[model samples]
Target: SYGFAVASVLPTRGQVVGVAHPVVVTFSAPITNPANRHAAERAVEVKSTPAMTGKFEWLDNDVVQWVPDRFWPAHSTVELSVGSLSSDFKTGPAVVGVASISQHTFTVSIDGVEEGPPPPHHRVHFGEDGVMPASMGRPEYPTPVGSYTVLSKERSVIMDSSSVGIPVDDPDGYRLSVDYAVRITSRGLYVHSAPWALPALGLENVSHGCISLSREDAEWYYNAVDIGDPVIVQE
Candidate 1:
C-alpha cells in the first residue's frame, strides 16, 4: 500500500498470480493535482522476485497501473511499500501539517514470483541405484514424487531415522551428525553429506533418501545454491 490507499493491491496476500494481473494501488482520494499525483506515484513501491522490468502509468488520477515490458516469470514475489514522500490522512481544517511516520508494509504473491523456491523442475535425478526406496514413492518411506524447492539449509544436523519412523533400536537406524544438509522437501527430505554411505556412494543406492554427496562436494553444493533454488525429483 502506498500513502493513504483508498482501493487496494491487485492480488491476494501471499498468493501467486498470472502475467495478466497488472499491479496497482488506487488512492481513496484521487490525485487530481499534478504534483500530488506524481507524489502518489513515488509513494507506491513494487518489486519483483526475479526483478521488475516495468514502468507505472496512471489509469486515472486515483489508480496507477504497472505495465511490464515482458510477462512475469513463473515465480514472483512482488512487495509493496509506502514511499517516504507520501500524502497524509487528513481532513477539514488541516494546516501546518506534519504527517506521522508511516510503516505500512503490504505484499502479494502471484505466479512467476519465485515466491519461495525456483519454478517447478521437470526432471530431477541423483544418488546411486541402491538409494533408499522410500524416496522414490515406496511404502516404507515413500518419497512422494513432485517438484520441490530447497526451502532451507543447515551446515550440519543429526540424522535419526527414528524421527521419521525407524526406531533407534533397529539395526538400520542410528543418530549421527550429518553435514551440509539442504532441505528439498516439506517432509524433511534433503541433499546432505553421507560419508558413511561409501558402499553405495555413486556406485549403488544407499542413503535413506537424501541426495548423498562427498564431503567437499556437499559443502560446495550447500553454498552454491540459494534459498529459492529448484530441486526436481524424477525417476
Candidate 2:
C-alpha cells in the first residue's frame, strides 16, 4: 500500500476578498494516490469570518484555486487549517518507505472591489488567404487578437462533427460539451476550442478568430472567471 504525507496553508494570510483575488494552493508534488489526494484536499480548509460562500476549483493536480461566486464581505478574515498525515508506506510485509512533508503560510489583503469594464463589441477578422483553412473554412474570416470579456456560458454546445474531424472521444476531443469563451470582435469571432484547427492555437490565426482553449480548462476558466472579467490577448 502507498501512503503519503500532507500539508496545508493559505497563499495569503490577511484579509482576503472574493471580487478580484483568488486563493491559490500549491502542493509539493503530483499526488499519486487518490486517497492521498483527497486527504490533502481535506487538510486545507477555509472559512470566512463573516461567512461568505465560495467554491474551490482545481487548476491542476498540484494546484487548487478558490474564489467566491459573488463578492466577499469587506473586512472578513479567512481562516485556513493544515492537517498532518502519515508519511510512511508499506507494500506487503516485505517493504517499507518514508517521505517528508513541507508546510508554509501567507496572507492576502483586500481593500474593496474594483468594477470591471463593459464587454467589447464583437469583431471578426479575415486573413490574407482567400480560402480559410478547412478547419476555419475561409481566409475571409480571420481572427483578430484583442482583450474581451465573457458574455455568457453554455453547457452543451452543438457543432458539426465533420468540422472537428475526430472520434467523439479522442484524447483531443471535440468541445461539444461545456464551453466558456468570450466574444470580443464583431465578425462572429469567439474564444473557443478548435480540435480540427488546421494550424495550432496562436500559431497562424487558424480559428475563425475565437480564442481556443482545452475542454477542461475552458470549463474551469468559464466557471472561475466572471462575465465581466477582463481578457487580454496578445500576439
Candidate 3:
C-alpha cells in the first residue's frame, strides 16, 4: 500500500471542458513532505493533441494542478498520467470574461466572439468604495488584478466575513446569503448576485472584493460559465 494515491481528477474522463480548465489531481492523503510532493510532481505527466507548456503547482498538501501557460488551444484532446492511473479529456469551445476595473464592465466572449447580455443586467460592480468616492478597492483591500478561472459554482452560499479574517464584531464585517455564486479564486472572490448594490453596478464599486451583478445577470453567468472558464480582471 502506498502512502498516497490519486483520489480524483477534474474534467473527469471523457468529459468536455473549457479551454481554461486545469488538470486538477487530488491525492487520497496529504503529501506533507516537500520531497514527496516534488516526487509526485515529477511522476505525473500531461500530453495533448496540440501540446501546450505548463507546470504543476500545489494547491494544498493533497492537491496538485497542471495549468497551461495560457488557455488550451480550442478543441484539444488532453491526457494525464501518474503511475498506472491515467485519464483523457477534451477541450470544448473557449469561454472567457474580461472585466474592466475602471469602466466597470464585464464582457464575455465565446470562441473569440463577443457576447453581451441585454441592457441593465450587463454591467458589473466590483470591490468597495475607496477613500475617494466611486473608486474600486481601498488601500488595504483592493480587488486583485489578473487572470483567474472559475473554480467552482454553487446555487447559494452564506458568506461570512469571519471566514476571510474580519471578525464578526468588526464594523466592516458581514454575513449574507447569496444565490448563483460562481467562485473565481480561493481567496473568497466571486461574481455572484448582489441586488443590494444594484444602483451602483456601472456607476461605482461597492463590495468587499467580489464582483457583484444583478440576480438575472448572475444567474445567466452562473449557467453560462464552465468549471474552467477564464475570468480576467484588469484596470
Candidate 4:
C-alpha cells in the first residue's frame, strides 16, 4: 500500500534558504506521464508566505521544480503546501514553514549622509572627512563615482596593491589584510575595516578609494548589507 505522501520538498521543515532557491520535489518511485514527464507536478502545491508568483515544471519522470519569475524579496518568508501522494508512503510534514532571506538594505555617501542624528531611517554616517579618494593621478586607485551594488562580502581579505597595477616598489604601494570587507564594484572598491587608518576614518581621505570604517563599524556594515544591495556614493 502506498503511504499518505510520496514527494519531498527542497527546503525541509523549518529551514531557511536563499532568495533564488527553487522548490524541488522528488518521488520515491518513477512517476512518468505522456510527455515522459511526471504529471505529478500538478499534485505538488506551494504557496509562499508573502506570495511568490511561479509555476511547477516536471524535470523528469520523478522530479518537479518551482521557480519564481525573479529572485524572491529579501528578508521575507516562503511557505509551502506540497500535496498529492500515494496512500502508503509517508513523507515529511505537509508544510515547510516560514523561511527567511537576507535583507538588501544599505546606502553610502561620500560624506556623511544627509539625515538627522537620530536617523529616521537606519543609516551609517561617514561625515565630511569620509570623502572618496582625491580620485587623481593613480588610475587604479580612484574611487569611482555614482551608484553600485554590492557584488559580494568577505570576512577577511588581503588587499594587494600590486594586483591593481601598483608595482611592489611603487612610491604608494601597500599590501594589507583587511576584515569585514563588502565589495561594491568589479573595480575592487570595498567598504572594509581599516584599523591602520583608524584615526582618519571620519577625518581624512586616506584609503585606496575604498570606503574606510572602524573595525566595529565595518562589521556592522557587513552584517547589514547583502549582495545586490544598493550602495550610493555621492559627492
- Per-candidate RMSD, Å: 18.3, 18.4, 5.1, 11.9
> Candidate 4, 66: how far from true, in Å?
21
Q: Which stretches of candidate 3 lie over 4 Å from their true place?
A: 1-4, 82-84, 120-140
* lDDT string, candidate 3, 1-235, tens digits: 5656788887798887878888888888899998887778765665654666788999999999988778876677777554557677888778787766786666667788765445442444334321011223433665689888999899868999875679877998988899988899987888888887776776676677777777766776777788888988888
lDDT of each: 0.49, 0.38, 0.73, 0.52
TM-score-based ranking, best first? 3, 4, 1, 2
Cα lDDT tens digits, model 4, 136-206, are 11234545556455567898788888656787668978888998887766668777777777655444555
On lDDT, the leading prediction is: 3
Candidate 3: C-alpha RMSD after superposition: 5.1
Question: What order do candidates take by lDDT, descending?
Answer: 3, 4, 1, 2
Which candidate has the top score in TM-score? Answer: 3
Q: For each candidate, what TM-score against the reference?
A: 0.44, 0.32, 0.83, 0.45
Sequence-dependent TM-score of model 2: 0.32
Off by over 4 Å in 2: 1-11, 14-20, 74-235
Cα lDDT tens digits, model 2, 91-145, are 1111000100110000111132222112221222123211111122224444333
Output the worst ten-in-a-row residue range by lDDT, candidate 4: 96-105
Residue-wise C-alpha lDDT for candidate 1, range 1-235, written one tens digit per residue:
4345656655445544434345656777777777776666656766545455657878777788665555444434445333432221111110010101111100112222211122222222233221221112223554444444456778768778875678887977778798888787656777676666644443444456566655544565565444444454544
Error of 1 at 129 (Å): 20
